[PDB]
Design an enzyme around this catalytic site. Sequence first.
Site, mmCIF file in Angstrom:
data_model
loop_
_atom_site.group_PDB
_atom_site.id
_atom_site.type_symbol
_atom_site.label_atom_id
_atom_site.label_comp_id
_atom_site.label_asym_id
_atom_site.label_seq_id
_atom_site.Cartn_x
_atom_site.Cartn_y
_atom_site.Cartn_z
ATOM 1 N N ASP A 106 -6.348 -7.356 3.591
ATOM 2 C CA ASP A 106 -7.433 -6.643 2.991
ATOM 3 C C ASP A 106 -8.401 -7.700 2.446
ATOM 4 O O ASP A 106 -9.598 -7.675 2.749
ATOM 5 C CB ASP A 106 -6.901 -5.680 1.897
ATOM 6 C CG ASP A 106 -7.993 -5.079 1.046
ATOM 7 O OD1 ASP A 106 -8.973 -4.494 1.611
ATOM 8 O OD2 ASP A 106 -7.856 -5.180 -0.204
ATOM 9 N N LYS A 146 2.667 -15.215 1.192
ATOM 10 C CA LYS A 146 2.937 -15.915 -0.070
ATOM 11 C C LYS A 146 4.459 -16.179 -0.111
ATOM 12 O O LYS A 146 5.150 -15.753 -1.035
ATOM 13 C CB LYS A 146 2.547 -15.064 -1.272
ATOM 14 C CG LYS A 146 2.479 -15.857 -2.587
ATOM 15 C CD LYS A 146 1.409 -16.976 -2.574
ATOM 16 C CE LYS A 146 1.527 -17.792 -3.858
ATOM 17 N NZ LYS A 146 0.373 -18.750 -4.018
ATOM 18 N N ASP A 188 -12.215 -9.067 4.538
ATOM 19 C CA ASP A 188 -13.478 -8.964 3.825
ATOM 20 C C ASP A 188 -14.093 -10.365 3.568
ATOM 21 O O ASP A 188 -15.334 -10.567 3.682
ATOM 22 C CB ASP A 188 -13.274 -8.211 2.514
ATOM 23 C CG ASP A 188 -13.276 -6.698 2.699
ATOM 24 O OD1 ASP A 188 -13.894 -6.155 3.625
ATOM 25 O OD2 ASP A 188 -12.643 -6.030 1.899
ATOM 26 N N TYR A 194 0.783 -1.226 0.000
ATOM 27 C CA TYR A 194 0.000 0.000 0.000
ATOM 28 C C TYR A 194 0.816 1.278 0.000
ATOM 29 O O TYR A 194 0.377 2.292 -0.556
ATOM 30 C CB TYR A 194 -0.968 0.044 1.199
ATOM 31 C CG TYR A 194 -2.224 -0.786 0.965
ATOM 32 C CD1 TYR A 194 -2.121 -2.076 0.424
ATOM 33 C CD2 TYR A 194 -3.481 -0.279 1.217
ATOM 34 C CE1 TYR A 194 -3.218 -2.843 0.181
ATOM 35 C CE2 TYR A 194 -4.628 -1.082 0.973
ATOM 36 C CZ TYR A 194 -4.453 -2.362 0.463
ATOM 37 O OH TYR A 194 -5.477 -3.175 0.172
HETATM 38 C C1 IPM Z 1 -10.590 1.636 -0.073
HETATM 39 C C2 IPM Z 1 -9.404 0.689 0.079
HETATM 40 C C3 IPM Z 1 -8.157 1.480 -0.277
HETATM 41 C C4 IPM Z 1 -9.305 0.036 1.459
HETATM 42 C C5 IPM Z 1 -8.061 -0.797 1.537
HETATM 43 O O1 IPM Z 1 -7.672 -1.496 0.552
HETATM 44 O O2 IPM Z 1 -7.440 -0.743 2.608
HETATM 45 C C6 IPM Z 1 -10.483 -0.867 1.760
HETATM 46 O O3 IPM Z 1 -10.548 -1.898 0.754
HETATM 47 C C7 IPM Z 1 -10.421 -1.376 3.200
HETATM 48 O O4 IPM Z 1 -10.670 -2.582 3.503
HETATM 49 O O5 IPM Z 1 -10.133 -0.513 4.076
HETATM 50 C C1 IPM Z 2 3.200 -22.889 -5.767
HETATM 51 C C2 IPM Z 2 2.786 -21.463 -6.115
HETATM 52 C C3 IPM Z 2 4.062 -20.687 -6.397
HETATM 53 C C4 IPM Z 2 1.783 -21.372 -7.265
HETATM 54 C C5 IPM Z 2 1.514 -19.933 -7.590
HETATM 55 O O1 IPM Z 2 1.406 -19.059 -6.677
HETATM 56 O O2 IPM Z 2 1.422 -19.659 -8.795
HETATM 57 C C6 IPM Z 2 0.456 -22.024 -6.933
HETATM 58 O O3 IPM Z 2 -0.100 -21.379 -5.770
HETATM 59 C C7 IPM Z 2 -0.458 -22.045 -8.158
HETATM 60 O O4 IPM Z 2 -1.692 -21.759 -8.085
HETATM 61 O O5 IPM Z 2 0.084 -22.391 -9.243
HETATM 62 CA CA CA Z 3 -11.059 -4.144 1.993
HETATM 63 CA CA CA Z 4 -2.651 -21.034 -6.234
HETATM 64 CL CL CL Z 5 1.280 -5.844 1.365
#
Ligand code: IPM
Ligand code: IPM
Ligand code: CA
Ligand code: CA
Ligand code: CL
Lengths: 364, 364
Positions: free
Chosen positions: A249, A193, A253, A143
């Site tokens: 994020d 990740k 949600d 961000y």
């Molecule tokens: C509006 C957006 C930038 C914000 C974020 O990504 O943090 C929202 O998605 C949240 O969950 O607060």
């Molecule tokens: C193992 C990982 C690196 C791979 C990715 O993130 O692409 C997997 O999650 C996928 O969906 O192929």
């Molecule tokens: Ca959000």
């Molecule tokens: Ca995957």
């Molecule tokens: Cl991040």
Amino acid sequence: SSYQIAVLAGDGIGPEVMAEARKVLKAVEARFGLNIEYTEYDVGGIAIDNHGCPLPEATLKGCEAADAILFGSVGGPKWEKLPPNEQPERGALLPLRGHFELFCNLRPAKLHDGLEHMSPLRSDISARGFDVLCVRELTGGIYFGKPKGRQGEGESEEAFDTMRYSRREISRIARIAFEAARGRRKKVTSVDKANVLACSVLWRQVVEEVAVDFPDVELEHIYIDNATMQLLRRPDEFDVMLCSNLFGDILSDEIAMLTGSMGLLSSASMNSTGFGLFEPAGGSAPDIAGKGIANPIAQILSAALMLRHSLKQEEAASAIERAVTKALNSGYLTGELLSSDQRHKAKTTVQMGDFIADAVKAGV
Amino acid sequence: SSYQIAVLAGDGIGPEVMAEARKVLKAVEARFGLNIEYTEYDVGGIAIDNHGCPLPEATLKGCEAADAILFGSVGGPKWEKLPPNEQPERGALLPLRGHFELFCNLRPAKLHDGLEHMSPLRSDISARGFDVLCVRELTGGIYFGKPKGRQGEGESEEAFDTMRYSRREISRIARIAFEAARGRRKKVTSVDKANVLACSVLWRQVVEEVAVDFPDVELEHIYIDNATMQLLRRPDEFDVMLCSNLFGDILSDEIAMLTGSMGLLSSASMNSTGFGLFEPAGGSAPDIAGKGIANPIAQILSAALMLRHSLKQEEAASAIERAVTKALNSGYLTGELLSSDQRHKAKTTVQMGDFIADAVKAGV
Ligand SMILES: CC(C)[C@H](C(=O)O)[C@@H](O)C(=O)O
Ligand SMILES: CC(C)[C@H](C(=O)O)[C@@H](O)C(=O)O
Ligand SMILES: [Ca+2]
Ligand SMILES: [Ca+2]
Ligand SMILES: [Cl-]
Ligand SMILES: [Cl-]
């Protein structure tokens, strides 16, 4: 002595639900002898309309002079065409988070008794119930990483964001997740990740460093693609979920939506110093504004988080929370919490706030 | 003239399900007069065991000499402690994607008739059904952006990944999503974080540029936190979902898991030149390996994608797909597709492959 609160109700349902939060805060101020003073300031779309930007300098200074921000919601179709970097939602929330160093975002998502039927989960999964706290790092990562922008023209024009974390940043958010797990069910699931991201490698490393201070908390690590699958399937196996900015994020949600009842859920964004921004989990819901329909519980519980976290008014926080519980268990549910064959029992926003302030007054 | 296929079965259930894919491919080669030659090469954990790395130079050269990769799955507890950047899953798949410029990942997720009860969705949502194609950009963004690494020591030590896209990269993946939507239900939902990410801003811009070539396809944009909520709730409203690398990773898996039946789902990773890597959507499932239990349908359908996309053998691809349909509608379901009161009807991997090759032979 007397607390100062910046009230940033914003757009859509924000002002009507804020009005209910403030009604309930009034009951609570009276019962516990709290002296809280409030100032309202424009933010989001109403701040663009009234002042040209989503976060007026005076809104910001109003926040600096406050002990906490009581925040509504921002965004709406009317501004939903502007330059992304002038838009109300991101225009209000990120500079607020950045300015006040609100690194810690807390969003607890629980499946409430009696509301299982509203959750989008298969009935045996929602019958199992869940209670998941998302601890999301809020002021770093992608961000706010630099460099961010774009260069070039034509096909070769490219845009870039840098996802960045330092050990310091990861360990302070991890500690929060760990202390929270301690007072819950003693599990942190750290979500990253690490198979792909250098940030996630350092993330996973540091969180393991922090876990030494918590021999009583179980730590596990999980990839964000995996975490999002597993939450649809077995949300009951997670206690605290510890995530970076972008992953938390998504996850906060997702879990909120798995409750089926977002209008009951609230969020605390906090800095290390006790100052925070307290808001409902759900959007500004412009389709239902001004009609007396919005669920004020989310905003009312934001106020409770505000009292507990910023104002050190634990008792007043818990009184509100019990008044909300009282409403949900005494037939005081707004329409979106009711099944379509029950929707005639629906309470309005004002009715919801009246009941909940009354319960506080009655000593719930 | 005669096709050459690199067979990279990997770990866990990979070899047993690959065996079934190859059985079904044998039925198909015979029926359509196709001359396909196959070579097996170690990848993932078996390549670390046999050769020291997840992607031996000779596996790689074997792939360069092939028309396509028939890929199983990789990963397992035995390697689940190694340095992230030596681990089998990411060690096999990302260099394979990178080397062969497999920029386009296709994972269609559909709720199959009769299998609604397995989906983790509430029964009225799964009864509505869904059919969502995730088009995921696979060779750029944050997976392969530079700079990537870390600097410093102590608290101030930091790790970083750069998320990067060029107009060229976004437009070629967008086109794929748009052409796919054309032959489906003519909607692309492009999934980004344009309120936060400079990449997502350029992403959203470019995808709109591409949409001009498709007056018949409806385009909408959605944030990834929003997309992940909405898929739990109303998966039926999405047709094609167009995502960057990191977001499509999350989304493809989420949607796959909402089917409730991942063992039926497959994936095509392709470059612009017709070469691809074809694999099941689901993991290597090391807990069930060698026991005759794994669902081979995912791997069998990967072979079908291989025939259609890389080998230009559309008819042979569709014969396999109809043989699979035939199995699912004739009581040939492995155990994980059966409700617990029905689990006694479970077919083994070999039984599944026998039936499906027989159906192809019979002219399904
Ligand atoms: C509006 C957006 C930038 C914000 C974020 O990504 O943090 C929202 O998605 C949240 O969950 O607060
Ligand atoms: C193992 C990982 C690196 C791979 C990715 O993130 O692409 C997997 O999650 C996928 O969906 O192929
Ligand atoms: Ca959000
Ligand atoms: Ca995957
Ligand atoms: Cl991040
Ligand atoms: Cl990406």
